[PDB]
Amino acid sequence: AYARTLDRAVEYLLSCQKDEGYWWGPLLSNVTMEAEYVLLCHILDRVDRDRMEKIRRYLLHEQREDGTWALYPGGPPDLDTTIEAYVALKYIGMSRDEEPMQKALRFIQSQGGIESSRVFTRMWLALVGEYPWEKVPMVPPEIMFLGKRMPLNIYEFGSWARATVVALSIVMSRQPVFPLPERARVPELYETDVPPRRRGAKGGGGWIFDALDRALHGYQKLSVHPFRRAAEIRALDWLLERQAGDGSWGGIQPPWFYALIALKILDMTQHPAFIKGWEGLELYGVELDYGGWMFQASISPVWDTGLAVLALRAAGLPADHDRLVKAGEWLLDRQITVPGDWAVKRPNLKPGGFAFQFDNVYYPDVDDTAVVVWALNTLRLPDERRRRDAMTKGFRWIVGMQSSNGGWGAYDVDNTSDLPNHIPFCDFGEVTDPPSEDVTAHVLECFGSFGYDDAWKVIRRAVEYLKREQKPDGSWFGRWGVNYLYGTGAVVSALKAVGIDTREPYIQKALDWVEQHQNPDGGWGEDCRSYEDPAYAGKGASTPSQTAWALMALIAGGRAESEAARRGVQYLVETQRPDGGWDEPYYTGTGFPGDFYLGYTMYRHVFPTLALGRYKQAI
Amino acid sequence: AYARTLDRAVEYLLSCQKDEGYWWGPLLSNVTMEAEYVLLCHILDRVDRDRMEKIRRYLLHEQREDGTWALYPGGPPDLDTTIEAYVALKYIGMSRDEEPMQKALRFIQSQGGIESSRVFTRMWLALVGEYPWEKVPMVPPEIMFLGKRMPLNIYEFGSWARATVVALSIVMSRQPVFPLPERARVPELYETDVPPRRRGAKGGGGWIFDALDRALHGYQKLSVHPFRRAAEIRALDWLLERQAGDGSWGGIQPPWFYALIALKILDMTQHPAFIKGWEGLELYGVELDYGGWMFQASISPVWDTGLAVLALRAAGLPADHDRLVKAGEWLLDRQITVPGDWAVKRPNLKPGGFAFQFDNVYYPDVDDTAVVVWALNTLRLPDERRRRDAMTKGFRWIVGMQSSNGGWGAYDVDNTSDLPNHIPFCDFGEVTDPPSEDVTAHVLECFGSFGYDDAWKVIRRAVEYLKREQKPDGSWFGRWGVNYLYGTGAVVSALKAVGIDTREPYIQKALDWVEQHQNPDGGWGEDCRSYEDPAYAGKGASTPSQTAWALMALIAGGRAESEAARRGVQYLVETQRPDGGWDEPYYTGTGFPGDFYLGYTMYRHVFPTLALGRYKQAI
Numbered sequence A, B: 001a002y003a004r005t006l007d008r009a010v011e012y013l014l015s016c017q018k019d020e021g022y023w024w025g026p027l028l029s030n031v032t033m034e035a036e037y038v039l040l041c042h043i044l045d046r047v048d049r050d051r052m053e054k055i056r057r058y059l060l061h062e063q064r065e066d067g068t069w070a071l072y073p074g075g076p077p078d079l080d081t082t083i084e085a086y087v088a089l090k091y092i093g094m095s096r097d098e099e100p101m102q103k104a105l106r107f108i109q110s111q112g113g114i115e116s117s118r119v120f121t122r123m124w125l126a127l128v129g130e131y132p133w134e135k136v137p138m139v140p141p142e143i144m145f146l147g148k149r150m151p152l153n154i155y156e157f158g159s160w161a162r163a164t165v166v167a168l169s170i171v172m173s174r175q176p177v178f179p180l181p182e183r184a185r186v187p188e189l190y191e192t193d194v195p196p197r198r199r200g201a202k203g204g205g206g207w208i209f210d211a212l213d214r215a216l217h218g219y220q221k222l223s224v225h226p227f228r229r230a231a232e233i234r235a236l237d238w239l240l241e242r243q244a245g246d247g248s249w250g251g252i253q254p255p256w257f258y259a260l261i262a263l264k265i266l267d268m269t270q271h272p273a274f275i276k277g278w279e280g281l282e283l284y285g286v287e288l289d290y291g292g293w294m295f296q297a298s299i300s301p302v303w304d305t306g307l308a309v310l311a312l313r314a315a316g317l318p319a320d321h322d323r324l325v326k327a328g329e330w331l332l333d334r335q336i337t338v339p340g341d342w343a344v345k346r347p348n349l350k351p352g353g354f355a356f357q358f359d360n361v362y363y364p365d366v367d368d369t370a371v372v373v374w375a376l377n378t379l380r381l382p383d384e385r386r387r388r389d390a391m392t393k394g395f396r397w398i399v400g401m402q403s404s405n406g407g408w409g410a411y412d413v414d415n416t417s418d419l420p421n422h423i424p425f426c427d428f429g430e431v432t433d434p435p436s437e438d439v440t441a442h443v444l445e446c447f448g449s450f451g452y453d454d455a456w457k458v459i460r461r462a463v464e465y466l467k468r469e470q471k472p473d474g475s476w477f478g479r480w481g482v483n484y485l486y487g488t489g490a491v492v493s494a495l496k497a498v499g500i501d502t503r504e505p506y507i508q509k510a511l512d513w514v515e516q517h518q519n520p521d522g523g524w525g526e527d528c529r530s531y532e533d534p535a536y537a538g539k540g541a542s543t544p545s546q547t548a549w550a551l552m553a554l555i556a557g558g559r560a561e562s563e564a565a566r567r568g569v570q571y572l573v574e575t576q577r578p579d580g581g582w583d584e585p586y587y588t589g590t591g592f593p594g595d596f597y598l599g600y601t602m603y604r605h606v607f608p609t610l611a612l613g614r615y616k617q618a619i
Ligand SMILES: C=CCN(C)C/C=C/COc1cc2c(cc1F)c(-c1ccc(Br)cc1)nn2C
Pocket: A027, A120, A160, A252, A254, A297, A298, A299, A303, A356, A365, A366, A367, A368, A410, A428, A429, A480, A591, A596, A598
């Protein structure tokens, strides 16, 4: 019955695998990426007409009926995303007259205009001279003087926000302006009678920070800024020391773009760092079959490879499959062996974690590391020496990354500072990197394969963390994945592998929750709105991945041989495509709860296989 | 008569010109370059058998009868050069038994052995574990803390030594050891009864520095070095900020090699700076027709192009020659417009100088700048706008570079500190960059073309400098060129263009000197020994370049229509090759008086043409 489904899904994943022996599917987000890229070229005075066209097709394509752009497919119209997309188009050639511009422009006005956009949006528009810097949250370079154990030090922010703050400090220090041609001027973004509904800080704004910001802008007008010269250099060197091998910064788009801009402001366009940092963009770019072009906010080569292996293994393929070996070998060469920003909190910790993308040694995450190691622990490589040693290194690294609450963060340890969540600047997505449920689960899921049970303290502390974080309805929040079906499925799956009894009360209360949200079509679905409105928790169009997750939660809970269980399996078997793949016009990945959403392409193929793989094990 | 010589010499230079429209002839030095390169690969664990072979052929080829290696062709056997060459060979595969090794080894012993080699030689041998660091001049990273106006600050050294000191400070801070295979161990370098004749500091060694060094080695053994961590980072960032575009450091081999080593010691082999810095070496490498391979200590693309243009112009080719335009355009794109280490002494000075090699923005020299600008002032480019503006920028830069004594240095201003010339480490070549005669002359020669005469103060101050530096025999020392025939020819040529009366006493006393050294073959020659023994001042085998220089000194002095004048011309006309070129098995370039000698390939073709060009003008 489901056998044919697996055999087809298996041969498919194996066909998507590259020559090197790894998997790498595109990462979807929103048009703000391409929109900002267009402006970046303008700033760097490196515009390519041919490329612009590919970007124009893309922008319009992603535009919906109403003429707006959302963070995720089938989501509400996002102001910011639309504003940036609007400016980009008009700059490429579009005229405010054309219908696509009309519907979009009207929407921007019906929301208060530019005065209702995030800081970033207003910042870029400020970089082009379409918005005064005076009304933009100030971030002085002096922040580089804050010691290791002081309030608001660059090391109290999230690895992702950190690099951005350091890069921007230099940019905002000079407050450069790169005028746009009269033909691109977008003053209409102001014409509006609707009251400006500005967005406050993530965790709220205190009068202190509000005043401090006003003070900075004032000090920013003085004729002499003592030690600011060194302050900037401190930021410049900081970046130069942590530049990714591919030329990026952190492997993400934000700091990368701002870093280049910072270098441009310092007349370092002929410096190796800049050269490399620029030509490295092409790697993240993608050619769309319909003549479009997009820029991935990031790449998941390692991540895809990791999951893919686990999926195929749990499916049936031998532990020494010559094709899987290509991956095992590849992964081993990805392991990081040099201290990163994480060392600041764990100096006596030996490097051994992996990154998300190709080359990003200074920012290895716990999630990838856990998956990669666990993926290798299920393979038989010709050289049991490096495989045995690699796992050990990564294993110990993870253990040394466990926070105080027993949980595991993503990049840093105990990075739970609540100060940066009030700064006027920080008003989009997360700013800190505190321990999460999903990540922790994946960690326990890793140790489980080795045998380590609840007897080991480290495991217990983690379990306690999960128990205290479990939601009232017995569900678990999803940090890097939409959403509760993702978290719950991850936790239960982990707790089952760590030895914990699946008959436990809180456990059962979780499984029941899963069956209570099984859509009519037999599949499971959870829209991204679950982050904004709780009424969507477990609700939404069914998807191959989400269905697989909620499916694993049952298979692990022992309800693999149940009604709702066989029900979901039927969905995956039917919805499957002739080629053995799966479609998924909805995002299932999460970057920032209610701010940034991602769409992992492989998820629709990997997980569905992993789910069926474990289902074929219960029998 | 000489017409045919010119027409042939002209069509030749035009054939050597590359497509881009520039000239670039190889730069010769000694085997220490390749020798150290071999060790570099060992250190970086990146050895290429195929390449090693090409290096072996080269080494042996450059070895003379006695089995030694000299700094220049036909020069005395150099210990250092031989030692490093010996170690390199034995590492490639050579056995201490083979004749080439025997004769070389014996020479090394007959000089005291390794204990009689320069600091660098002993340093590399220390990097491979063949020499104890304890007996190597210490250079602590703490030197990076010395302010701008303090004793022995990195900015008191020569631009070339500076980068080296900063890079090595990190290397010597860790004193790393990279063991050589037992087959390459070179203990025989110690077996010697001859007393070790060590080389002292350039300007002598004071008991202070001698003691200070002993103190450092002691402090180097302690268990805790406070602030040394930051001291290193200060050096690391310093390098990262000034890395050449081609991936080098200063455009020279020394700092480049040590910089890479430093990065390797910091586990930054996967950092962009390193990657770029490594793959950039190939650009300086050269494939020898006889299967050999060499590494240019530096490249003279800009320098060659500059002189070549002036030569062809003074020859007869139109000021708008379509072929010369290719150069004019190319040169304009080479002009630097960003602050360099020179800004430390001249913050209010606008960038406009040029570099010696392709991409080296942070180290523009006065010599090249003067030549390039002066070369453009004799051309008619389609865009008189950038040509007029370029000259102005470079012109003003040079003026702002004039030292206190009215003379012009090479890279920095008033860099005449006499403190670094006593440090135990500095014992090879120059360490500072004080004003020179040749450079200054070239500067005046530049202004002269514009019209600025002795009336202008800046010119006068320069002339006074030259007058006070003129040697007793009415000759002028040659800093970057062997030697007195080079300096004298440069000065007289300049003083003639600045309006100064060529009938002047000190002037005539110079011309007479030239005629008094005209070899019987009608040509002029000056061996490099002129730096060690004064009895060689103006003596040595005649060469196309040197003959041309001493020839210009006469043509400028008004003695163009003299006996010795027409005599030299005859030499150039006869010694000329069928293809219109010229041979020169002797070096005429100078890096460090009595330490490092260079051989500019184009010199044998350019100058000879320039000389004949000006000779055809006197008539
Ligand atoms: C579970 C998988 C691995 N796990 C470890 C999550 C990491 C995913 C890497 O991809 C991204 C990470 C990002 C981002 C985007 C990614 F695609 C941003 C980000 C996005 C927009 C703005 Br504005 C600022 C930051 N921050 N961070 C950490």
